[PDB]
Symmetry: C3
């Protein structure tokens, strides 16, 4: 894909909702059709069917598959066979090996565990990698914690640490850098603060979970 | 040891004070009998004797030995021979090699120097490692600095950086993560702030230097 | 050089201004004669001549050359041949290989890109390395960002992250650690805040761009 030529506003769309695919594509620069946590276990087969029969522009669409070694990932790659999509997003990305096993597809590695953070440079350097993202929710959950943000709403230090780690790793290897979702959709103030800062430090994209977040991201990245 | 099954409140007890061993054990989830900085040079031989003749439950006791390559460490491992203790804490932990040389004991690596921070993943990955701790005092001292905390009492950035480094390294390799001592014993407000945050981000333990700190730690880690 | 024996106040002096060399040397502990960004492209040949015909004490002078692989660097090393200088500062330092190729000179590696940050330990460990510095301006510029500082004037997180990275890498390998320039010359309050903190955490030097910054740095590092 010409990832950089596409704008900064990327939008998750659960793949079990094909009636929303066209609306997502019109709202966003890039849509991430989601086969992982956006879709309940029981509707994953239906999601994979929707992925096949309701296509989007593959120049502006990536598919978030399931994690390495899972039966779900294998089912996802089978469903992808029947599409035109070239680029996948790998959740819980933890090693170069997990990225390499996805060749010949392009891979956006989503680092959201300690092992992924520790191995970020190796992940970023892997040949299939075209982008790096981070996520604070599963980072804190897999660390054994309870909250990625403190009471005043700022990310805790370990999240801040991982954010910088992934920005540096991505940039060191010439990869797109994607900043984490702002989970509080109606908190447009916080999103604006994050996206302005992301743009300022060289993130290429801020990933969104609701179409209302796209204009705020696009404005933050204006220059 | 079943480290995780033991609670979050660990308590240093200088090994040259056997009259306090039973009181420490009753107050704490785990006692760290200390042969390093808790004990003056001249009383280290007496500490090693106390370690032998005044036993604690080895399921709930770890021994902090002296640093790699020191004559004191060699004397410590000799004294340990006559005990039932299985788990040691290695101060100034700086390489996998320093941990491996302690096999077949289990090792909690205490990272408190730049080299330890830089090599944290290697240390965490070493076969004997069961836990990682950090310390800001000796980190700043060995860096050549003067204060780990700024005037408003917050840790300086390099300390914050090392804290996250060790949390991630420990979690990446499935090790217990131990948060640093709160040196200002009577500052229970600061300890509560640190321990609540530690619990939130996935530390397993907050290490204490005074029995009064244990209830505050236990409450912070409640869930 | 006896780098540590020289004081904490280092001062950039563009090498195309030999009429200022003596004044810089009298004001500063160490002068960095600059052949890179301090000197416009068209005056670099003149700078290299000045470097030759207007000598400073080589015990108290380092030369900032141009980046690895550039034609300018090659011209710089040729000009250096005719001087007594032993120690160079390598901008945009990105690998051990870039440092090693400067042997047998001593090298202060200036990390100011993502790749340099990611490879900081390798850079620090390289045999010619005697010091590590960081720079936030080119870090943010090469990341693709727009501002190293947020609106309240604090460094953004990625800059803070790289600062700690370089401090740790330098200290882990026994190298001098140099803190970044305070670009707002008249902001002596901010410089004092930075230099006091730098001194506190174990930086050896704060690099300056104007002689007025030297007394503030010297006082901050007093103890």
């Amino acid at each position: 894909m010409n990832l950089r030529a596409a704008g900064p506003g990327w939008l998750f769309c659960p793949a079990d909702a094909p009636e929303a695919f066209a609306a997502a594509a019109a709202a966003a620069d890039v849509v991430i059709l989601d086969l992982e946590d956006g879709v309940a276990e029981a509707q994953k087969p239906a999601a994979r069917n929707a992925l096949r029969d309701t296509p989007l522009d593959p120049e502006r669409t990536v598919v978030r598959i399931n994690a390495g070694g899972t039966a779900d990932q294998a089912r996802d790659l089978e469903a992808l066979a029947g599409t035109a999509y070239t680029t996948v997003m790998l959740p819980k990305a933890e090693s170069a090996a997990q990225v390499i096993e996805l060749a010949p597809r392009d891979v956006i590695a989503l680092v959201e565990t300690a092992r992924g953070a520790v191995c970020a440079a190796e992940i970023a350097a892997a040949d299939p990698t075209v982008g790096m993202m981070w996520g604070a929710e599963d980072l804190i959950a897999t660390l054994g914690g309870s909250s990625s943000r403190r009471a005043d709403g700022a990310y805790r230090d370990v999240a801040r640490h991982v954010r910088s780690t992934i920005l540096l790793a991505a940039s060191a290897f010439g990869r797109l850098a994607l900043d984490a979702v702002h989970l509080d959709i109606l908190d447009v103030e916080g999103l604006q603060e994050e996206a302005r800062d992301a743009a300022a430090v060289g993130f290429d994209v801020t990933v969104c979970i609701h179409p209302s977040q796209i204009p705020v991201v696009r404005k933050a990245y204006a220059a």
